[PDB]
RNA sequence: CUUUAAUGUUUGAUGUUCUAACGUUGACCCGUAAUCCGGGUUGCGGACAGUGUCUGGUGGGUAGUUUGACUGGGGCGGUCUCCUCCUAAAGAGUAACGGAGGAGCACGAAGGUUGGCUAAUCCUGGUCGGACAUCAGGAGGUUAGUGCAAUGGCAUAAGCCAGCUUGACUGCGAGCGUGACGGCGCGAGCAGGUGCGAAAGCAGGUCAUAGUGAUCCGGUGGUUCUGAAUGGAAGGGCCAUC
RNA sequence: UGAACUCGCUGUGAAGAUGCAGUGUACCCGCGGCAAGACGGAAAGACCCCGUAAACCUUUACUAUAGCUUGACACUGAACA
RNA sequence: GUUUAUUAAAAACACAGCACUGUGCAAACACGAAAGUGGACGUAUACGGUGUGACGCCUGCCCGGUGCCGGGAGGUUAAU
RNA sequence: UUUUGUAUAAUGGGUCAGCGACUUAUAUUCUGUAGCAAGGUUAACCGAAUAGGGGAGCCGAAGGGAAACCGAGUCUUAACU
RNA sequence: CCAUAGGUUAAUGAGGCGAACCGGGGGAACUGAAACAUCUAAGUACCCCGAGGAAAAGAAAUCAACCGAGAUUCCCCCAG
């Protein structure tokens, strides 16, 4: 039997050119009007996965 | 949306259950050895309102809403419905 | 869709390039409906391209080798 | 063995420490935009080529070396940068 | 708790909107502030809604 | 709105009657030497009951499970997140059921900018007037004030008032600070577009640190970005947001 | 039933010693006795706590369900008010 | 009289009696996916359940809570 | 053996001999190694078959974006010093 | 009355057993989710019926893409 990729991780990451992963920030679903504009701008674009939690992403999806 | 377990509401704290909303007049607290604690909460009805007596255990909570009691001023009669008047915000009421 | 370099371009058959005869060369696949030509380097033969989508730089490279690109 | 009852404690609440203080010390070459001093109030005031954020955070506005002064009539500490 | 939120609908043709909080039980009139619009690139007066 | 009918009403609510469905654990006849069953007239019921599907109520009769953690044993009581100070040993960080207080907000002015101003409390004099209203003068020195606790801070004032206003604006942001990480915090300056000031300049919130929770799912508005043959739409995507 | 060529004492020590240190007494080996010790033998403590263990039992704990119960349709029709 | 055979024979349970309540018979109720049996080849002086426990003297007040029973007006309410 | 810690009076073993515990399949990843090298390799299957045919496919050489799209660039943006 | 239901006799056929494989009827829980109710476990275990040497499906009211492929089964892929 082959490895089954966790579907909750494949829909939240994407393989970049040199093996890394990009991801979406998580503060952007509700009562944001109490936050400032500067907090709502730097969380809009995608960012890379830090190396402290990089080994969990590689292990939970071998194929992608 | 509030929460009040039996170690919280003690006097003059309204609770809401199914309803109608009730009011606590006085209560005691027993914490007996071997077993769970309880409270002889002597509730008071608000709508009809005569009395209801329940012995709440340590579980569970109850919604507390609404509590608001304030001074009003009667000034008007028409058919069936009546009205009142404030003196701190001057808002109508039916 | 599938991307095609300039290396696997002089070996299609003859000079003509379309969705077929790249399918027989086994560099795109069978389920491909759209194909492109991307500047990757070292094209020699006068390749004739029809129906593909040559981006910007291979159009300045295939014509630099003697090719003609049409829709 | 008998066991008497025990009381309670009203205390026991503290915060996350905010890591305030001087970050770059004197005679230390910094880049433009580097935080020099994080502080609640202006213990250190902003001198030449040093700004003051909304958090009273003294940040570098040019490249060069961190310099501490004791300037002013009220004998207060300023922080300057000699542009290098 | 008391201070609810409002929606500042742009009075121009765009569908852009700012949002903010306004205590209704103190000043019950609408807000007519005049801020920047990132779509029309004008300085359109905004109107209060829910 | 209501009392009142004439009408095609939409049709329910029951109430008698009739028998041919159905019930018959009433008799009688036969299969049959058979209180089972089946057929036959007939008698009493009768479109009720009863059963099947859908559906609300009741339901420990029964079944599956849950019933928190730290803890100077478990329990009981108390705490769980965030903010200020001390413990904390002159960078930072640092525990205990160690000593103390607060927060789950407020504001369209209490924000931005320009101009102008400097208190607390005693003392003297003074209509009603007093320990304390307002006025005049001095001593005095920020012991005052800062929307709200606490430390730090502020006179160039962040303290107070007024004129004029919405920079509490969109797209970015070299850089570092702080976290295991999710994240948080500061940010010169560039581009577009305004505000105030003659002008230099300042403004992407409030003197600063508390006033807040990740995702999933679901709702509203916009944007052909996709849209299961094609042309559309539904549903998804992006962005604003509940 | 780990192996023993298996003393008393005070002290130390995983915190109550036939084995350690100091010192004292004691020829080697059975039988009959007595049970203070070998934290003796027998039961992976029954009590207490822990486990995101199980079991039954209880109830206005949660979601369900047998059974009971209401209505509509179906078997189910005909005359008049 | 009966009971924890295998540490508890009792103040436990049972008991005649008493009272409430259910049931008009194709009974209530129980067993059974159902037909069918028990109840009973009985039928309210009968039967099922519940509580108390011979007998003598007695069994007071309270309908708010909960359960049960009755009434249906008004309000809220499913499939359709 | 488990522990901050054991002669411990903490656990286990009367002794002997025999048996008794990190594996297997298929995936993926990294190191060492071998072959070929901008290319490498075949799977089932035909097969006088561990030979030879079989390129269906997989991976790499091009990435960026949510996507259409664009492409040594690209996205965000009215445009990016 | 006719006729049936029923009764007797004959003819041919079936009953039962079998190691697994296949179609249909019925159908769990432990476990995994670090608890657990949806789900997973799993249409698995097992119960029951019926058929064969294999059985089941099977000659399009099917895909497909606007070009075409022509029933079913099985194996490698597509593809975690």
From Swiss-Prot, chain A:
The keyword Ribonucleoprotein applies. Residues 1-21 are annotated as: Disordered. Gene3D superfamilies: 4.10.410.60. GO terms for cellular component: cytoplasm; cytosolic large ribosomal subunit. Transmembrane segments: none annotated. GO terms for biological process: cytoplasmic translation. It comes from the Bacteria. One of its GO terms (molecular function) is structural constituent of ribosome. Keywords: Ribonucleoprotein, Ribosomal protein. Pfam families: Ribosomal_L35p. Residues 9-21 have a biased composition (Basic residues). The keyword Ribonucleoprotein applies. Belongs to the bacterial ribosomal protein bL35 family. Part of the 50S ribosomal subunit. This is Large ribosomal subunit protein bL35.
UniProtKB/Swiss-Prot annotation, chain B:
The modification N6-(3,6-diaminohexanoyl)-5-hydroxylysine is found at residue 34. Disruption phenotype: Disruption of this gene leads to lethality or to a very slow growth phenotype. Required for the expression of poly-Pro-containing proteins. Keywords: Cytoplasm, Elongation factor, Hydroxylation, Protein biosynthesis. Pathway: Protein biosynthesis; polypeptide chain elongation. GO terms for molecular function: ribosome binding; translation elongation factor activity. Its main location: cytoplasm. Involved in peptide bond synthesis. Alleviates ribosome stalling that occurs when 3 or more consecutive Pro residues or the sequence PPG is present in a protein, possibly by augmenting the peptidyl transferase activity of the ribosome. Beta-lysylation at Lys-34 is required for alleviation. The Pro codons and their context do not affect activity; only consecutive Pro residues (not another amino acid) are affected by EF-P. Belongs to the elongation factor P family. This is Elongation factor P. The chain holds residues 1 to 94 of 188 of the full protein.
Curated annotation (Swiss-Prot), chain D:
Residues 1-19 are annotated as: Disordered. Keywords: Ribonucleoprotein, Ribosomal protein, RNA-binding, rRNA-binding, tRNA-binding. GO terms for molecular function: ribosome binding; rRNA binding; structural constituent of ribosome; tRNA binding. Signal peptide: none annotated. One of its GO terms (biological process) is cytosolic ribosome assembly. It holds the Pfam family Ribosomal_L27. GO terms for cellular component: cytoplasm; cytosolic large ribosomal subunit. InterPro entries: Ribosomal_bL27, Ribosomal_bL27_CS. Belongs to the bacterial ribosomal protein bL27 family. NCBIfam families: L27. HAMAP family: Ribosomal_bL27. Part of the 50S ribosomal subunit. Cross-links to the 23S rRNA. Cross-links to the A and P site tRNAs. This is Large ribosomal subunit protein bL27.
From Swiss-Prot, chain E:
It holds the Pfam family Ribosomal_L33. It comes from the Bacteria. GO terms for biological process: cytoplasmic translation; response to antibiotic; ribosomal large subunit assembly. GO terms for molecular function: structural constituent of ribosome; tRNA binding. InterPro entries: Ribosomal_bL33, Ribosomal_bL33_CS, Ribosomal_bL33_sf, Ribosomal_zn-bd. Keywords: Methylation, Ribonucleoprotein, Ribosomal protein, RNA-binding, tRNA-binding. PROSITE patterns: RIBOSOMAL_L33. One of its GO terms (cellular component) is cytoplasm. The keyword tRNA-binding applies. Part of the 50S ribosomal subunit. Cross-links to the P and E site tRNAs. NCBIfam families: PRK00595.1 (NF001860), rpmG_bact (TIGR01023). Belongs to the bacterial ribosomal protein bL33 family. Surface exposed on the 50S subunit. PANTHER family: 54S RIBOSOMAL PROTEIN L39, MITOCHONDRIAL, LARGE RIBOSOMAL SUBUNIT PROTEIN BL33M. HAMAP family: Ribosomal_bL33. This is Large ribosomal subunit protein bL33. The gene is rpmG.
